[PDB]
């Protein structure tokens, strides 16, 4: 009596972003989910919070992927971190090869790694979620400030093959609104919510992309879903807090206990 | 919110280790965090054969430096350690960060008929991580191996293993029995230093029980971290994988996982 969701993505040391915000924001949405895992990212607690990656072998990669998409099934499916140009490729070749449903590609941030996350896997996605950074990124244009910007760069992605796309904005945006801009083929619309004052939106990204899969996955319009993945992060951001000095995650229970 | 550590495995079908634990413990609304020691995955085109990928010491060493040292935590607990080096490493960071609540999951690696073929692993987990326990929670074959006796069969040989256990220096032990257990009922022995209770639920006629010990012992582990009572929190713990088990349901021919969000959705919560 489960749907199943698949997230390609890195693991978070902190506990607020990548697997363990997806598998947490799966769990809130009654939705089964699995990992492939990519990289294990830590912080070094004595020398100010400094990531330290290390990466995961490509067949590593591969093996989890062949249980995951040959061995069960999955509803939907995101990509978080993909760290290497390989792991970007070996994506995109899962994606096609087993034909993967509601693909929703969350273009986490080297030269040809942008060009092949533009090249290779956002022609396949049914949704793209990247923030503003990420969004100059794909679309090769300069630092978003407006909510006009956001939609020209919205337009610009769309034309290299994703079906739908999410340029997220929020707290980097300056704005009295929490505002993202959603693009099907034809027409723009902005999404808002109320801007939470805080600095703590730690994983906010990876928990939205999630969430939007989570949605999928139940067999959710594209839309009603990103909706309610607007809907879940916003409650999630309103009841954030610290962890210590340097990262404050967000809520993923707030929707449900609120 | 409370928080908890795994030091674990992942488990690429996702009912077992760490996606058992992070699904657990989300449900239970405790913030998690993974150190993660192995990647286990199936190969679909051979009967579902498990391929273990270990990963470095330092690469745990360096999670558990961020999640131990860099961010606190209420209670915790160890799964898969399939290396000695691990083993030690998890009391190392047990003892030296003086952690609290101790979920200690024997689970063993290189199983065979009822022993071990990999002794100093079993040893290790014996003489190294079983006195730092607040609750350890063996199944059937783990309870035999920590206990140095044979298959156990009865309620009657739980209780002594219990008991040979716990003098090991577990604060608490839980033998879980259930599905291999011939029995009326889905029973667990636990064991204070004085004396034997015998934990009853429904059985569940279901082959559908992967990564139940994992979702049992994290359980304990979220209801410790919450300020619970240790007993308290394992009848809790024992609350939650009845009815996960009794709204399990396959994946494919090999494997049908727990449904962790039973307990909120499929009894009055
Ligand atoms: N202060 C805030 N208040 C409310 N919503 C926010 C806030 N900051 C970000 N969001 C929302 O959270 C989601 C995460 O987007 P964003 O922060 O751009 O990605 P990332 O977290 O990867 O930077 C977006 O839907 C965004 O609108
Ligand atoms: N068929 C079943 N019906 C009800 N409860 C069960 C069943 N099988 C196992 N359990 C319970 O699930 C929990 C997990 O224990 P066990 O299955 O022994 O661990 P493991 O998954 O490590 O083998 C225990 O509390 C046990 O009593």
Same mark, same amino acid.
């Given at each position: 009596?489960?749907?199943?969701?698949?997230?390609? &993505?890195?693991?978070?040391?902190?506990?607020? &972003?990548?697997?363990?915000?997806?598998?947490? @924001?799966? *769990?809130?949405? %009654?939705?089964?989910?699995?990992?492939?895992?990519?990289?294990?990212?830590?912080?070094?607690?004595? %020398?100010?919070?400094?990531?330290?990656?290390?990466?995961?072998?490509?067949? =590593?990669?591969?093996?989890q992927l062949a249980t995951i998409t040959d061995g069960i099934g999955v509803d939907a499916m995101k990509?978080?971190?993909? $760290?290497?140009?390989?792991?970007?490729?070996?994506?995109?070749?899962?994606? +096609?090869? +087993? *034909?993967?449903?509601?693909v929703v590609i969350d273009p986490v941030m080297y030269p040809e790694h942008a060009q092949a996350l533009?090249?290779?896997?956002?022609?396949?996605?049914?949704?793209? @979620? $990247?923030?503003?950074?990420?969004?100059? *990124?794909?679309?090769?244009?300069?630092?978003?400030? =407006?909510?006009?910007?956001?939609?020209?760069?919205?337009?610009?992605?769309?034309?290299?093959?994703?079906?739908?796309?999410?340029? @997220?904005?929020?707290?980097?945006?300056?704005?009295?609104?929490?505002?993202?801009?959603?693009?099907?083929?034809?027409?723009?619309?902005?999404?808002?919510?109320?801007?939470?004052?805080? $600095?703590?939106?730690?994983? &906010?990204?990876?928990?939205?992309?999630? /969430?939007?899969?989570?949605?999928?996955?139940?067999? /959710?319009?594209v839309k009603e879903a990103i909706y309610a993945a607007k809907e879940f992060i916003t409650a999630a951001? +309103?009841?954030?807090?610290?962890?210590?000095?340097?990262?404050? $995650?967000? +809520?993923?229970?707030?929707?449900?206990?609120?």
């Amino acid at each position: 009596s489960m749907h199943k969701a698949l997230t390609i &993505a890195g693991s978070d040391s902190s506990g607020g &972003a990548g697997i363990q915000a997806d598998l947490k @924001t799966f *769990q809130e949405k %009654n939705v089964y989910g699995m990992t492939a895992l990519t990289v294990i990212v830590a912080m070094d607690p004595n %020398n100010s919070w400094n990531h330290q990656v290390f990466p995961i072998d490509t067949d =590593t990669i591969r093996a989890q992927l062949a249980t995951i998409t040959d061995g069960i099934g999955v509803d939907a499916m995101k990509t978080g971190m993909l $760290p290497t140009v390989d792991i970007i490729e070996l994506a995109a070749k899962t994606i +096609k090869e +087993k *034909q993967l449903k509601n693909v929703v590609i969350d273009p986490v941030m080297y030269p040809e790694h942008a060009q092949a996350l533009r090249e290779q896997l956002a022609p396949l996605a049914t949704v793209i @979620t $990247p923030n503003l950074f990420e969004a100059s *990124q794909l679309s090769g244009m300069d630092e978003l400030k =407006t909510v006009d910007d956001m939609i020209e760069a919205a337009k610009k992605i769309h034309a290299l093959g994703a079906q739908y796309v999410v340029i @997220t904005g929020g707290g980097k945006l300056k704005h009295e609104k929490a505002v993202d801009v959603l693009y099907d083929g034809e027409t723009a619309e902005v999404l808002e919510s109320e801007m939470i004052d805080t $600095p703590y939106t730690h994983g &906010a990204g990876c928990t939205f992309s999630a /969430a939007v899969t989570a949605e999928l996955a139940k067999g /959710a319009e594209v839309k009603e879903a990103i909706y309610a993945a607007k809907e879940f992060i916003t409650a999630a951001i +309103k009841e954030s807090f610290p962890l210590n000095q340097y990262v404050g $995650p967000t +809520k993923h229970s707030a929707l449900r206990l609120n």
